[PDB]
Design a protein around this ligand. Structure first.
Ligand code: SF4
Ligand code: SF4
Ligand code: SF4
Ligand code: SF4
Ligand code: FCO
Ligand code: FCO
Ligand code: F3S
Ligand code: F3S
Ligand SMILES: [Cl-]
Ligand SMILES: [Mg+2]
Ligand SMILES: [Mg+2]
Ligand code: NI
Ligand code: NI
Lengths: 551, 268, 268, 551
């Protein structure tokens, strides 16, 4: 038996420490720790509600856009502002394109090197690698010639003796199961992913004004001036340019990312039976399309004890059942006030006292929903959509299962989705469904402008007396996000962010109940305690973002 | 052939300064790491984690002593003996000072490392400071913005590699090719400013004609940068003002994260 | 699904207005011809030649009567009864007037078709005139420039296809989204103009700091266009003034091809 | 004897009519006719010499840049100005990148549909098509999946019933020899060529200010302000951006265009034995690299009666032997003055009298070199480089010959280059060698700026009295270009352009000698006189530009 630390965890956003007790070659107990704090909630306090979004967007640059959009929704909630529908279409295109970039980069740049052995790719036969994909993908860049060019780049890097960020990786580890050919295919797709995510961010840039950190929002709508006949503003030429990038995303997503997801499951089927983090799941509906902050294209809901048949739908960002359930505790976090707090009454008073296994060991708070631990993110999102009977989601999951079936002769049941690989599958399904969101909202915008609606912004008024509370919900790439603003005498008197990685990464709670990361690791086999690749595989499946978790 | 080594350490960062690289086109991030540099340490992209990646860093600091470029994003928190950012059980200020000792050049990428940025704003809960403040004996090159256009960074590194010295710097150690001029002294909306043609609210008739954003709070008059010329993302025509929103002054100490969006700039 | 038909006739053209399409990105020329339109006649790209391509044109003029967009590049020469441009043994003015009879919309792409352009300058050897001059009864949409940014044309066509009418036009029948403003009333070098910061010669200290090009003969003050905002080639930062050369006024009748490069513009 | 007319010739620049007498299915005599004139030489007269280049660049938008560069060189010649070496590097990068775009578009968009049958591509097996290229190309976009996607685009266009510019083409013509698979490969490459030429023009744009019609020249140098430390000028960031596009060109050029050129020769070897236009060839050296308008990267020269061993090298744009040899006649052209004229004494007095077989029948003049007809353009350029013993040229030709030999078991002799296919080969060899010109001149620029030379422009003085004469030579994509400027009392008193398509397309001369186009067509077999595809194959090999030929 022994105690290990993984510090830093790499190929995530931000500063994470994982500790594990290992007994009989299996993790028996784990600790997740966010090791950096900024106090972004305190920084934004006492300012004009209209200014918050530009400050709190800087909670995170990986999930850029998300905190900006949640912040304006929170101020709009407090003020009772209904956002113009053109502003919703623009906000939705930005969030969908951003999320496409975010998921692609997660699967390839952050996660793939847990599953892929680049040294093994040097032994691959490029022609055999290409032949393996016949009838599996229609992607146009799986030729032996592409694969030979990629193999030669790896050869040249190894030959230089400067491996840099590829150095001292887990090459030849016993948990690395891909054949040489499949390792080479994965590296080729890793490089191709960088082109696709660049195109996704060109969509974001043309509406946001730049990315990272968009600059087109406002409490009351957006700053984009719609005028098809206007020089220097959002005209038909600019919209055609946006559409030219939207159109470039689908083929990679459907023919590479979706297929690679099915193939990793086919080679690692044991990872369908481990990394369960919770039995409760939450997601919020997303992509409002009406004039009153509703009519979401994606549904939300709450699943309790893995029961899809009895889930509770959430159709509104003003749902009092959702609002009243959410609390956070700092019993095992480095803050002073430990009892569960509703975020409108939340405090963030730092109380660092160092690491204690049984005391405080994280800057991440511990969120609960009506006193229960909950997993959020793409697995939650997918399970809620399956519970809602969403045909688009059923059909897309079925396409991944059909590739898995063809490769293995086995099927995938919903029970197998409560796992490390299920989490990865939910993320991929989300990325695929987002391409229809982009086509739908671009078309909606063009149609609405054509009806003569160029409105984008309604100037708010903020009473100089009174106390008003608002909450802005958003289904972020990592899961349900909420910003909670209290306005008193015209200025922000409280600001609390409850972020998806807070839900998943948070330490033991007021009742010493274990959060998703810590729960998911129990039972993980660790072949080599000095090189705990298996632990990092499960932790990466949640797409940790610690700037998000802690803020 | 050997590529120039780079060590990248994140302090109180949001990761947006690394993410800027994923929008770059000259070079792309894949060409940066395979052709232009040897990225010897970067926790966002590293195959190795924990003990293995800390071994990589120690080895690289020894092997490339006097040769590597050190890059830091995020502010460095000094309050309570550095415990507001701890990596491998040690304050990030100590990781940064150790890596700084053998650096050939030191770059503060982003407003947070260049002058404290958003993390040091308001009451500054963590006593966040700039990279230059933690390295008083060292010349830190400052590449501000939240985040900067990634080429403000990549062309600075390229100048060091190709010509063997930093680019020309102003009195805040910012490269003049990117930060040598006020945005308002090279802004395509200056004619509208000059004529008193101002947007008064988003979506109004002037705003929908691309007029000047001064009366919406534009900080171009008090912000040094290349946002109006180099702009962002290399697609053409993309910067906050061209999209319809005022400059917030995110490049500039005392402007971004201090002044309200709608607060008016001082004009020189 | 059926794509909207286009007939493209070149008169006294240099082919630069067609070549503009090969730089376009939204749509690319391959997407234009396979997805956006049906290019029924274009002599630069046509598989058919001679009698076969003239048959194609006759068939398309009949099948798509009242439905096609007619596009003309180049000036139309009236001197000596039309003989300065003869195709299949007939004056091009006769081909253009015949195609104009059944057109849903008529576009003069480029300065030559919009107002005579370079081909009508100086002594005007061929009595070159504009498309509007040869089609007095017709509303010709003018998309000037030598050549225009191709999207000035493509977004005009897209407005006709998507919304069923032309874009809003100024009093020269130019689309306002592209030609509604003087270049100098939306030029990023206006601050330098305002401060008296002028390049005096190429390669001088002011020129090497990106100062205003007024005293090099910049015609921005007298030229309507979108060169400073939309710019060219969708790479970012690319238009004549940004590269270091004054606007010549190529969009604007009586400016381009009339005034010398270094002749000073009148300022409003 | 049957008389046919081809009017208009399509897939060229501008307005061309070709007439042929056909005896027993073989062309016995031909006429070339430029049918449009502007009088660009008269338009530019009586102006400031500094203004000419902006006006005469509009001679042509396909060969944009070329007339601009020849015009400033002509003014610099008259004024005795030595151009700064940085201005030469920038001019050279623009011309090389422009010529790359020009050749790629000529081979694919203008010429391929003479040789390629798109209806036959519909019967192709995409897998068999891909297998044919194994060991023939390393290009990464020759997969069955790429070819299936392209085949489906063709299928969808045919299914629409709207073939547009693909309508009433020469599908099933007896001179179409490619198998279905090779037709489908060619269409895939046609579409891929459009991406490569777009990258070439991004190089041109970043130095020129736009393309078509660059705007960065001056009499005395260039308008680009070199300052690595300058905001808004040509700094290191902008140079890195230019380099990023230069780097994108090589793979298509070497792995697609070069290979397709060898393959077309392999399937059409009879086209190595017809289309000889001349026995004399001229090219000028190009890409000056010193401070005195010389030290050219590419050599020039004069070949008489196809004898490479006795050719005359041309190493200077001030070569009196070259200057004194050039004359033009209008005996069979629509101009008044018919005796051969040296261009400094040239006139362009229109005298249209309609078509006459034995009289005047073209707006193109008839150029001669010391009284001989001469072919210019890539065939001339290649043969002169081979005569010079340029190893880069011999090696690149040998790579095309090696692919041809692999497919046919036959070699190619220099005698077989005096032909329609030899002309196409010389074009491809030029495009391939230009990629090393771009690398070389980008490196030269970076190195020179590093030495502290930021100079770009020498301000001219123009005497207000006196008469003086200058000539600007340039090796354009279609061949040797010259602009001839006479300055009198400070203004242009004469301006004459002698353009490469003038040499090739001009009508019968003062001695009734036949020019290259007309000579090349003698002996052409014409299977179907209603559909004379064989005539257009030979004419397109010269890359006709009639706005250039006539001006
Ligand atoms: S400068 Fe901005 S983008 Fe960079 S680390 Fe700081 S908050 Fe993030
Ligand atoms: S105030 Fe802003 S928008 Fe107006 S001219 Fe200045 S920088 Fe441009
Ligand atoms: S407008 Fe300019 S580019 Fe277009 S045909 Fe006329 S000269 Fe050529
Ligand atoms: S004169 Fe030309 S460069 Fe100067 S501000 Fe006006 S348009 Fe811009
Ligand atoms: N996605 C994302 Fe970031 C996290 N966790 C937020 O919200
Ligand atoms: N190339 C080209 Fe144009 C022709 N002929 C010129 O010069
Ligand atoms: S907010 Fe920042 S990105 Fe530029 S436009 Fe203003 S300095
Ligand atoms: S010369 Fe023409 S392209 Fe624009 S910059 Fe001036 S109108
Ligand atoms: Cl509108
Ligand atoms: Mg919080
Ligand atoms: Mg001439
Ligand atoms: Ni995040
Ligand atoms: Ni030409």
């Amino acid at each position: 038996s022994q105690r290990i630390t993984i510090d830093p965890v790499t190929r995530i956003e931000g500063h994470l420490r994982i500790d594990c007790e290992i007994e009989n070659g299996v993790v028996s107990k784990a600790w997740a720790s966010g090791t950096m704090w900024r106090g972004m909630e305190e920084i934004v306090k006492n300012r004009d509600p209209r200014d918050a979004w530009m400050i709190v967007q800087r909670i995170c640059g990986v999930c850029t856009t998300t905190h900006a959009l949640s912040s304006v929704r929170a101020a709009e909630s407090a003020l009772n502002i209904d956002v113009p529908v053109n502003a919703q279409y623009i906000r939705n295109i930005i969030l969908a394109a951003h999320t496409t970039h975010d998921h692609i980069v997660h699967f390839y740049q952050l996660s793939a090197l847990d599953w892929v052995d680049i040294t093994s790719a040097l032994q691959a036969d490029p022609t055999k690698a290409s032949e393996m994909l016949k009838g599996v993908s229609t992607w146009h860049l799986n030729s032996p010639e592409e694969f030979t060019k990629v193999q030669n780049k790896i050869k040249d890097l190894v030959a230089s003796g400067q491996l840099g960020i590829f150095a001292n990786g887990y090459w030849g580890h016993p948990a690395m199961k891909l054949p040489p050919e499949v390792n080479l295919i994965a590296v080729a797709h890793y490089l191709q992913a960088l082109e696709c995510q660049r195109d996704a961010n060109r969509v974001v840039a043309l509406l946001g004004g730049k990315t990272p950190h968009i600059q087109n929002l406002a409490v009351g709508g957006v700053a984009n001036p719609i005028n098809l006949d206007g020089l220097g503003v959002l005209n038909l030429e600019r919209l055609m340019y946006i559409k030219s990038f939207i159109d470039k995303l689908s083929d990679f997503v459907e023919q590479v990312y979706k297929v690679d997801t099915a193939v990793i499951a086919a080679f690692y089927p044991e990872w369908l039976t481990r990394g369960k983090g919770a039995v409760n799941y939450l997601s919020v509906p997303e992509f409002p399309t009406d004039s009153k902050n509703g009519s979401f294209l994606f549904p939300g809901g709450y699943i309790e004890n893995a029961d899809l048949s009895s889930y509770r739908p959430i159709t509104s960002h003003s749902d009092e059942y959702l609002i009243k359930g959410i609390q956070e505790s700092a019993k095992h976090s480095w803050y002073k006030d430990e009892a569960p707090q509703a975020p409108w009454e939340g405090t963030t008073i730092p109380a660092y006292d160092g690491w204690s296994d049984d005391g405080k060991y994280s800057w991440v708070k511990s969120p609960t929903f009506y006193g229960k631990t909950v997993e959020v993110g793409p697995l939650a999102n997918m399970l809620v959509k399956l519970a809602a009977g969403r045909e688009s989601t059923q059909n897309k999951l079925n396409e991944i299962v059909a590739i898995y079936q063809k490769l293995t002769g086995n099927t995938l049941e919903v029970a197998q989705l409560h796992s490390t690989l299920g989490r990865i599958i939910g993320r991929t399904v989300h990325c695929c469904e987002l391409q229809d969101i982009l086509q739908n909202q671009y078309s909606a915008l063009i149609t609405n402008i054509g009806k003569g609606d160029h409105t984008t912004f309604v100037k708010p008024n903020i009473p100089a007396t009174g106390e008003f509370k608002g909450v802005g919900f958003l289904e972020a790439p990592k899961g349900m996000l909420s910003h909670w603003m209290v306005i008193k005498d015209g200025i922000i008197s409280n600001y609390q962010a409850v972020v998806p990685s807070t839900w998943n990464s948070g330490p033991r709670n007021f009742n010493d109940d274990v959060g998703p990361y810590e729960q998911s690791l129990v039972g993980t086999p660790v072949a080599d305690p000095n090189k705990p690749l298996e632990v990092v595989r499960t932790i990466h499946s949640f797409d940790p973002c610690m700037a998000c978790a802690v803020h | 052939p050997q590529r120039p080594p780079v060590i990248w350490i994140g302090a109180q960062e949001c990761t947006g300064c690394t993410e800027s690289l994923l929008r770059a086109t000259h070079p792309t991030v894949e060409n940066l790491v395979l052709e232009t540099i040897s990225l010897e340490y970067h926790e966002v992209l590293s195959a190795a984690f924990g003990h293995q990646v800390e071994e990589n860093k120690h080895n690289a600091l020894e092997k490339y002593k006097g040769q590597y470029v050190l890059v830091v994003d995020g502010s460095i928190p000094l309050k309570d003996n550095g415990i507001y950012c701890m990596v491998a059980g040690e304050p990030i200020v100590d990781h940064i000072r150790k890596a700084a000792e053998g650096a050939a050049a030191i770059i503060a990428i982003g407003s947070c490392s260049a002058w404290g940025g958003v993390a040091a704003a308001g009451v500054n809960p963590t006593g966040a400071v700039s990279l230059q403040e933690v390295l008083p004996g060292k010349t830190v090159i400052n590449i501000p913005g939240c985040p900067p256009n990634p080429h403000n960074f990549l062309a600075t590194v390229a100048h060091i590699i190709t010509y063997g010295k930093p680019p020309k710097l102003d009195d805040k150690n910012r490269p003049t090719f990117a930060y040598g001029r006020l945005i308002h002294e090279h802004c395509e909306r200056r004619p509208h400013f000059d004529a008193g043609r101002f947007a008064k609210e988003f979506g109004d008739e002037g705003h929908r004609e691309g007029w000047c954003l001064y009366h919406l709070g534009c900080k171009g008059p008090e912000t040094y940068g290349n946002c109006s010329t180099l702009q962002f993302c290399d697609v053409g025509g993309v910067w906050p003002v061209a999209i319809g929103h005022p400059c917030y002054g995110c490049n500039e100490e005392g402007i971004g994260f201090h002044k309200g969006i709608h607060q008016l700039a001082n004009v020189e």
